[PDB]
Design a binder for these strands. Structure first.
Lengths: 178, 178, 178, 178
DNA sequence: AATATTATTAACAAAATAATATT
DNA sequence: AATATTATTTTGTTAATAATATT
DNA sequence: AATATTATTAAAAATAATATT
DNA sequence: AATATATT
DNA sequence: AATATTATTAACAAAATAATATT
DNA sequence: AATATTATTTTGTTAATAATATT
């Protein structure tokens, strides 16, 4: 079993590490998406809709690690700019469904063009281990915790990502294209 | 060299993981600390003050993972409640220095008394790996990325924590007391 | 810099681990191949010849860890039994190259029909960590150390072993065949 | 479940790695001992008996990786050389116990002062990783496999070493002495 | 009753100013 | 040469409820 | 919207009594 | 001899 | 005229469980 | 069981003998 000291020490390490990593990720994500007048949760929302079509607001919240209310308010704002299409189904009218307009695909796609990994801070602070291991780091221990907390459906998102990157995009010149 | 697609795959993966961890950690921090009329960043300041004495507001920003402005305004409020004390020095009258008050140490102590690891969801996510490895996980990769983003001086924090848990607090009655 | 004491600690950990893993693997490998009157090193040489064709005795000894003389002597016996064929070039008549006959390919194929993962104790020894990780362990650390001792040319063997086996073997009735 | 393709990939990877690493450690351990008219398993026995004082032949044939026959024979030879001494006990007479003479304690102490980590090639393989992490590698994955093969009693031979080194030995003059 | 929202109310925490202070 | 460290006062994200329409 | 029963309390055809016819 | 309401 | 290594090929010297008998 | 004798080996060690152009 565990002494109280061991529990306390593990929590303070993992508390400060999560906080540090997330803050650097935040700053960089924001610089990138400050053109186009988008908040971080907004971009998250569109991305989810690309990989999952016809999702529920609540489903959205689950993948997008945000509260359901934040998802509702922001997706309404996204229909105002004309980037998303709401819908409803006859069998049950409680749930509301979300799909992506053509301008949305245009935003996401154009935005992919502008990705420059080098600017991002984590990429650079993780490049040492890439050569040592010949491959980019896979934080299995985080992946284990996070799978336990959030379950096995949540962890589908990663798979879908790699599955979409291959056979829905290609590399030309120095950037990625359809 | 790294192909572009490789960089994008590493980026989305690390992004989703840090968001899921910090969101969980944030929630479980706030619930514990709400009774004392203290926000997350105010608690983080008090903690920095106990482990680093006579710091300057920028230094507690650096350790705290918070901007300079939030440090100042929250440290001011904490002088109002009486938990913290301001100070200044002759070498340079520009810097403002910060120390804890006797109330402050009492507040942090009580917070240690009211600690139940089984409530935090990270802790419970981590136990499965403790059985396999006989000790609580050290996310060496994440620690190494953090050094290259934040520097070695910042990291003194972990060392100081560990040291100052051992000496002043003694385990007794399933509790911690001087 | 390190203390002497820490180095003594690392030596003993790694020297006792290595002895355990090789001793145990040795016992099972011997069992599996004994019906064909074959030494561990001999089966090694046959395998090398499958993956790396037209390879010198120095190459055979490099990839299968062994002295030049062990490789040459044993290979002589394996050309007597008719498993392999000796060939010499028209430039640098010093070098003797090896290839593999249809008899030797027959014995290797037939062995592969007798492979059973559960009798192998190191196989069962891993199943705990395959369940948690979701994939078999990759021991990057050990691989680091081996590569920095033997050089990246040596490690080609692994890659080649991977690709060959995925392309030219399919599973029929639960046993692998061409 | 597991396809037999997966199981073959794992076996071959772990076979090659285990073999390479043990072959390196044999090369260096034999030279460190050869001046003292010793072989590897003999040395291993003297060490065992330093840390586990009263033991049976079967015990030292568990902790040192060897058969019972080898333990009895190599120990007898060491009685002749005068390094070890045999005992027996009334409660159960079939057992035979071993202890270390002062000549044996001497050869072990003499040997300690010929320990030069920079010669041995594994240590040199580990140094990059110590530079990156900040400490020497613990290779947990190997430890789990080995524990799942040899049981927890066997693993005690690690803890005992870590303890003795920290108490009985002392570091001065770039060397380790009582 | 329990399920999916929708519509407000607070509050955390920076982004962007002002101005005192070391040669 | 302007800069460095507060200090003052401007913004926007995001989520914790409270009301509401469907099974 | 879908499921339901326990009650309260309520509101199709024959036959039977009284009324006028 | 005729008629005249409760519960997920 | 000088200057060297390089890759085999032939022989000795070990160890290691494997069966194998006895309080 | 837990020893205490015997038998079968398969990794390695060093000797000897050949093959190449390049300063």
């Amino acid at each position: 079993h565990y002494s109280i000291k061991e529990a306390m020490l593990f929590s303070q390490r993992i508390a400060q590490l999560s906080k540090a990593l997330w803050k650097s990720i935040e700053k960089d994500w924001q610089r990138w998406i400050k053109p186009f007048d988008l908040n971080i949760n907004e971009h998250h929302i569109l991305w989810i809709a690309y990989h999952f079509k016809g999702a529920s607001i609540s489903e959205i919240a689950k993948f997008g690690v945000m509260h359901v209310s934040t998802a509702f308010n922001f997706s309404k704002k996204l229909e105002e700019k004309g980037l998303l299409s709401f819908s409803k189904k006859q069998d049950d009218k409680r749930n509301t469904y979300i799909e992506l307009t053509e301008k949305g695909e245009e935003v996401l796609m154009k935005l992919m063009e502008t990705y420059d990994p080098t600017k991002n801070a984590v990429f650079n602070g993780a490049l040492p281990l890439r050569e040592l291991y010949g491959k980019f780091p896979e934080i299995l221990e985080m992946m284990c915790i996070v799978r336990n907390i959030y379950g096995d459906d949540f962890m589908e998102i990663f798979e879908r990502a790699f599955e979409n990157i291959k056979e829905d995009f290609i590399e030309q010149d120095g950037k990625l294209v359809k």
